[PDB]
């Protein structure tokens, strides 16, 4: 009942810290989670949100959805078949996804059973005191104690949970959690929100909808994907529209009621209405701090409910740390993992290291997808007196042949024009998430535009566009956009 490290949440951050502490530094580690495999009732399980109801199944389902475009695009290359025979079997997809996720759940079970001094406990972790975690049967802090774990070090890694707007009829709505288990593909669906989850699910539902189907995405403000490159936000909007998705911007559900046939009658704040089979809310995720009973030991939370941390993931309470989505910063699996690897290398390795939250490569598995690293030009322009933007945008030749002429590839490089340092790189098109990864390494090394343009291209690729840009398309001078420098 005594451990060097007790980890609450067997997720992206918690398992990296757990596994590293045990295998690299021979520490004794307890990891707590509420469930051993994916799905209802608690959705996240052993492996965490990404594995169970996140990156991993989403990416499989986006890959499934991409075959709608491949089957169509094949014709330009001479592929012939009965287009009238094409059916998308959603139930097949969900069964394949469930088996893939279950195998990961079982692989992490193997990990725990095989590894000496790495123990999994099932149930709800909360803080009794500075150095004791209690595991209870439920999230009710009044439920039975299953275990009482003594901890020299405590890691909070409980991740996040979907936010559901408190509107009349919210009980008729789902989150991404339930989207992964829909028994049938909705004919009509409203994805609510302008972020990556709404956009990615609009793509998935668009490909699997039965005949006479319609995907509508609504977003309360003027343009989806706030925080991404503006050219890309506008282009994704166009390319989703071109593939049959209806984008309702400046719109937000005020309420939902059930029609007598079980369908949903959505009333917008504007007075507009829409009938759909599914209303998927994807308006935000909030850190999971409530169930940890953090008041018991006085861990400080943020305005927003995230665990306050320093650069070394330390709470205000010594021996208690917090990584990943519970900190309510960048909610990405590789950031959680990086934080956990740094924390353990620091605390047990005696090799202090801090996660760099700048120049983080990330992606949106929109069709086609986004790959991005570092600053968008609007942000650069407020920090740097002179910003250059290098931009290449065109329909690739293969998509002039495929018939998807609307698939404009966008490559933007944002520099500090004073020394040429690359501040950010923004890609839209097939392979963007794959192209961007080694760009993250380039930015860590303070690559300049001349490092890209002096590197020899791999031909033919989309990626080589990044090595062909010698001349700014335009600038920001003290925050002001202009074609040419003074």
Ligand X SMILES: Cc1cc2nc3c(=O)[nH]c(=O)nc-3n(C[C@H](O)[C@H](O)[C@H](O)COP(=O)(O)OP(=O)(O)OC[C@H]3O[C@@H](n4cnc5c(N)ncnc54)[C@H](O)[C@@H]3O)c2cc1C
Indicate whether 5 belongs to the interface with Mg ion (CB under 5 A). Answer: no
**Could you give the CA distance from residue 317 to residue 300 in angstroms, rounded to a whole number?**
8
Contact by Cβ (8 Å): 208, 171: no
Q: Which residues inside 79-118 make contact with Mg ion, applying CB under 5 A? A: 112, 115, 118
**Could you give the CA distance from residue 62 to residue 240 in angstroms, rounded to a whole number?**
13
The item of Mg ion, ligand X, a copy of itself, none sharing an interface with residue 14, based on CB under 5 to 8 Å by kind, is: ligand X
Q: Give me the least distance between CB of 466 and ligand X, in Å please.
A: 16
Q: What are the start-end ranges of the E strands in 441-485? A: 474-477, 480-482
Indicate whether 163 belongs to the interface with Mg ion (CB under 5 A). Answer: no
The per-residue DSSP string of 120-170 comes to: EEESEEEEEETTEEEEESSSSTTSPEEEEEEEEEEEE---EEE-----TTG
The item of a copy of itself, Mg ion, ligand X, none sharing an interface with residue 301, based on CB under 5 to 8 Å by kind, is: none
Contact by Cβ (8 Å): 178, 57: no
**Could you give the CA distance from residue 334 to residue 16 in angstroms, rounded to a whole number?**
10
The pattern of x and - marking residues 396 through 415 that bind ligand X according to CB under 6 A reads --------------------
Indicate whether 288 belongs to the interface with ligand X (CB under 6 A). Answer: yes
User: In the sheet where 188-192 sits, what is the strand order?
Assistant: 246-249, 214-219, 188-192, 278-281
Among 363, 380, 388, 391, binds a copy of itself (CB under 8 A): 363
Which residue in this structure is represented by tokens 């609510």? 192
Pairing of strands 361-364, 370-374: antiparallel
Indicate whether 306 belongs to the interface with ligand X (CB under 6 A). Answer: no
Closest to 363 measured CA to CA, from 334, 392, 324, 337: 334
The item of ligand X, a copy of itself, Br ion, none sharing an interface with residue 222, based on CB under 5 to 8 Å by kind, is: Br ion
Which CB sits closer to Br ion, 320 or 381? 381
Which residue in this structure is represented by tokens 């209690």? 134
Indicate whether 89 belongs to the interface with a copy of itself (CB under 8 A). Answer: yes
Indicate whether 250 belongs to the interface with Br ion (CB under 5 A). Answer: no
Q: Which residues inside 33-92 make contact with ligand X, applying CB under 6 A? A: 33-35, 42, 44-45, 48-50, 53-55, 58
**Could you give the CA distance from residue 124 to residue 379 in angstroms, rounded to a whole number?**
41
Among 156, 189, 292, 414, binds ligand X (CB under 6 A): 292
The pattern of x and - marking residues 269 through 308 that bind a copy of itself according to CB under 8 A reads ----------------------------------------
Cβ-in-10-Å burial (0-12, 13-18, 19+) of 474 comes to middle
Q: Is 80 annotated as a binding residue?
A: no
Give the interface with ligand O0M as residue ranges (CB under 6 A): 394, 397, 457, 459, 464-465, 468
Indicate whether 222 belongs to the interface with Br ion (CB under 5 A). Answer: yes
The pattern of x and - marking residues 187 through 216 that bind a copy of itself according to CB under 8 A reads ---------------------x--------
Closest to 185 measured CA to CA, from 171, 206, 165: 206
Q: Give me the least distance between CB of 460 and ligand O0M, in Å please.
A: 7
How far out from the chain centre does Cα 477 lie? 33
Catalytic residues: 459
Indicate whether 14 belongs to the interface with a copy of itself (CB under 8 A). Answer: no
Q: Is 11 annotated as a binding residue?
A: no
Q: Where does this chain bind Br ion (CB under 5 A)? A: 221-223
């Amino acid at each position: 009942k005594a451990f060097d490290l007790v980890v609450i949440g067997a997720g992206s951050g918690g398992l990296e810290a757990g596994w590293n502490a045990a295998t690299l530094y021979g520490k004794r580690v307890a990891v707590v989670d509420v469930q051993t495999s994916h799905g209802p009732p608690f959705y996240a399980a052993l492996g965490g949100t990404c594995v169970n109801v996140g990156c991993v199944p989403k990416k499989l389902m986006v890959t499934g959805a991409q075959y709608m475009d491949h089957l169509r695009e094949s014709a330009g290359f001479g592929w012939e078949f009965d287009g009238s025979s094409v059916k998308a079997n959603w139930k097949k997809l969900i069964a394949a996804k469930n088996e893939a996720v279950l195998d990961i759940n079982k692989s992490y079970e193997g990990m725990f059973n095989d590894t000496e001094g790495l123990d999994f406990f099932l149930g709800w972790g909360s803080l009794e005191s500075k150095n004791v975690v209690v595991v209870r049967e439920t999230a009710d802090p009044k439920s039975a104690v299953k275990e009482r774990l003594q901890a020299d070090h405590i890691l909070l890694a409980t991740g996040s949970w979907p936010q559901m707007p408190a509107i009349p009829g919210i009980e008729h709505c789902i989150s991404s959690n339930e989207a992964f288990y829909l028994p049938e593909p909705p004919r009509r669906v409203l994805t609510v929100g302008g972020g990556f989850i709404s956009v990615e699910f609009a793509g998935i539902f668009n490909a699997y909808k039965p005949p006479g189907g319609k995907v509508t995405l609504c977003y309360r403000n003027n343009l989806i994907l706030r925080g991404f490159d503006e050219t890309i936000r506008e282009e994704v909007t166009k390319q989703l529209t071109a593939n049959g998705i209806e984008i309702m911007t400046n719109e937000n559900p005020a309420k939902v009621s059930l029609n007598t046939d079980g369908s949903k009658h959505v009333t917008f704040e504007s007075g507009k209405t829409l009938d759909v089979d599914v209303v998927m809310m994807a308006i935000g995720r909030i850190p999971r701090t409530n169930d940890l009973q953090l008041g018991n030991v006085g861990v400080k939370l943020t305005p927003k409910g995230g665990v306050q941390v320093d650069e070394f993931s330390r709470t205000n309470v010594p021996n208690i740390y917090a990584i990943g989505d519970i900190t309510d910063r960048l909610m990405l699996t590789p950031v959680a993992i990086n934080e956990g690897a740094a924390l353990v290398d620091t605390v047990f390795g005696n090799k202090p290291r801090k996660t760099d939250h700048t120049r983080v490569a990330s992606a949106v598995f929109s069709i086609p997808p986004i790959g991005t690293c570092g600053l968008i030009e609007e942000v650069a322009a407020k920090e740097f007196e002179k910003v250059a933007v290098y931009m290449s945008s065109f329909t690739p030749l293969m998509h002039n042949i495929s018939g998807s002429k609307y698939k404009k590839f966008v490559a933007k490089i944002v520099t500090n024009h004073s020394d040429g340092t690359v501040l950010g790189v923004h890609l839209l098109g097939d392979g963007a998430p794959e192209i961007i990864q080694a760009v993250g390494v380039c930015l860590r090394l303070n690559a300049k535009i001349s490092d890209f343009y002096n590197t020899i291209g791999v031909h033919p690729t989309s990626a080589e566009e990044l090595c062909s840009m010698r001349t700014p398309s335009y600038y920001y001078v003290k925050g002001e956009k202009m074609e040419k420098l003074p």
